[model samples]
Target chain A: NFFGKTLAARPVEAIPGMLEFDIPVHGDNRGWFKENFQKEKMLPLGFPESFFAEGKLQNNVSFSRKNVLRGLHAEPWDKYISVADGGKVLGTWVDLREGETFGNTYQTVIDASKSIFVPRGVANGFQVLSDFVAYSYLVNDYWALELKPKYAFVNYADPSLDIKWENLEEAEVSEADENHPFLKDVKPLRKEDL
Target chain B: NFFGKTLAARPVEAIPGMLEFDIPVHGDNRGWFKENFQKEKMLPLGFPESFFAEGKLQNNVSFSRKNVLRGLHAEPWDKYISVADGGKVLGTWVDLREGETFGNTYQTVIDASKSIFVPRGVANGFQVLSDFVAYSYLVNDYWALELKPKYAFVNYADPSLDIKWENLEEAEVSEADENHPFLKDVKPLRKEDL
Candidate 1:
């Protein structure tokens, strides 16, 4: 039943297989402590050891300056993200799974105090909301950079998704990211492609 | 053969299965660009594609302040590191591979302009040298956090290593790290443990 009845009852499933929640961080006079990932606590919220059985878990961290926009990238793996330091960012995702809600988009503000879990079949991205942002992520499978061209990015500005670039003063983009095709023109993805 | 004659002849292999070298960084008016890893360049130096056939490549970044020391840890996979921002660190490792070099220790200074390649069967750690340091790494395999206890850490202060913690005013270590046993008493590791 995911999280609890109270939190799940809010109908915030902007898109299926998406979870945005606050991870408890305890602080006092000295400093702060947090359990970023605990299976016991997460099991009740639908995350089980078997949830990541197919591929092993890996990690990555990114430091983005203001206006540094990344992604609308999708892959066949789950992503767990947390902000370790600095400012906030608007996390946006689009559902590309094979279902009725396919193509639907969702957005959430991720603060340093929160965590976000994005499942496979979803395209995700973010825009730095302050001077700088330090972002870290855990993934179920390893990232094959050699396969990047075959599994290219999804255009963030695709009109089909209609995502709003709110709270950003200016957005900087790379040549490759700036030229991705519209969602409608993207090469259809197949499970076997991975 | 790795890296070609000219570069390889420089005697950069300070330790068994370890390499320290300067990566080419090109700079101009706008900004700077670097080819951190290139098959053509690295293959001649030592790393070949065959080295990572089983598991895909993955990445991680660590931002540490002065006095912050990490690892004295070992794993089954090789680590390729580079300083992406800020300062430097003293990279240290102990060769634990199943060979004559086992138990031997090595140390090297890593600057923002250099890269360090740490092979498997080695226990490694580092001490931040600047006010802040941004370190990035690439691994051939994913890290399984669930198996953590089965593979504990190597004590950084183990008298057996005899590493000189020069330049550091004071080092800060976590309680867990401080409690790690001496190299002699730590559980013996086998290649199969990977």
Candidate 2:
């Protein structure tokens, strides 16, 4: 809801409602550098100009070790995530939007070469695929920590979502995330509440 | 000279004027979290309260793979560095301050559990000791990228510095860092320039 409208740019539909872009990188013998996001470049690729002009984008960075799972959490906001350093991850999500196939889940392997755009109504999580990974995200809404459980998480192992965590023996989830209720028993977040 | 003065913090005099702290970390099964720096805690540990009040701290994060060496670089400002993610490293530096022992080099093994405080006029660099490492730093001054070679780098293998990079056959360095002039031939930067 925070975005204006989508224009045409090269976005691969990673899932029904999620989009991914192969970001550009430049490097040489010394080091490497990449431009993660810019107003003009993103505008043509379905981002609203006001999103940048209003300065509503808030950044959060997280580092994870191999086999660590950070979510199954969702909010009433959109997210633009990129792999900033070191390794790769399997970015997974389960849709909770009020529509057909409400509990459907999807996933994709993400690396430093690309970025993903996740819309609201989707609970997202990532399993670190490398020894170390640094993920960066820019959210359309500011996180109000005081609002505990407002937009919360679902158990990553919830059978109703039918997630196939392909390559790992087990994932290390925090106690809080581990205690989240199963997807089928959770309340749905409507688009209007966003 | 960049610091106002040190109070009574337990700082180990690693080299001539540099200080080191075996930072304390707290965690459990829920997951681990540590405050790398706090104005109140740091001030009592030898940092100046005015430095915190003035918001002079600038942060930069770097991700490196094993054998990837990032520096031999220095500026007029001071630095406080911490390992924020997986793996370990050998943090090394050479004193460039005027007076005695201009090229005296020192090093220490650093991991996620510790931090080092490097003073101005010291050239710093590191070699990754594990699979991957994420290093974060708080500097006394803001970085200006356009000042290419402004806060510059020296050749990692400079004979004058005489660094013994222990336990590694070779290192992977950027073209820019590899080609920097030896320390003896470089123009000296004084404390006031910081």
Candidate 2 regions exceeding 4 Å error are A1-70, A75-86, A95-106, A116-122, A130-145, A158-164, A167-179, A188-194, B1-68, B75-85, B94-107, B115-122, B131-146, B159-164, B167-179, B189-194
Give all candidate RMSDs, comma-separated.
Answer: 7.7, 8.5
Candidate 1 docks with a DockQ of 0.07
lDDT of 2 at A132: 63
Q: Candidate 2 lDDT, tens digit per residue, A90-160?
A: 98888777666467777777765667777777788899888767666667565567544458468887765
Clashing pairs in 2: A29-B175, A30-B174, A30-B175
Which stretches of model 1 miss by more than 4 angstroms?
Answer: A1-12, A20-62, A75-87, A97-99, A111-121, A134-162, A167-169, A175-194, B1-63, B70-88, B95-103, B109-123, B133-162, B173-194
The estimated TM-scores of all candidates read 0.58, 0.58
Q: Model 1 over residues A1-194: C-alpha lDDT tens digits?
A: 11122221112376665776566544432223344454445556765354456645544455567777878888766777766443478888876654566677878777545677777667888987866665656676644776563353578777668688764446876778788777776665554654
The candidates score, on chain A by TM-score, as follows: 0.81, 0.82
* lDDT of residue A79 for candidate 1: 77
Best TM-score goes to which candidate? Answer: 2
CAPRI band of model 2?
incorrect
lDDT winner: 2
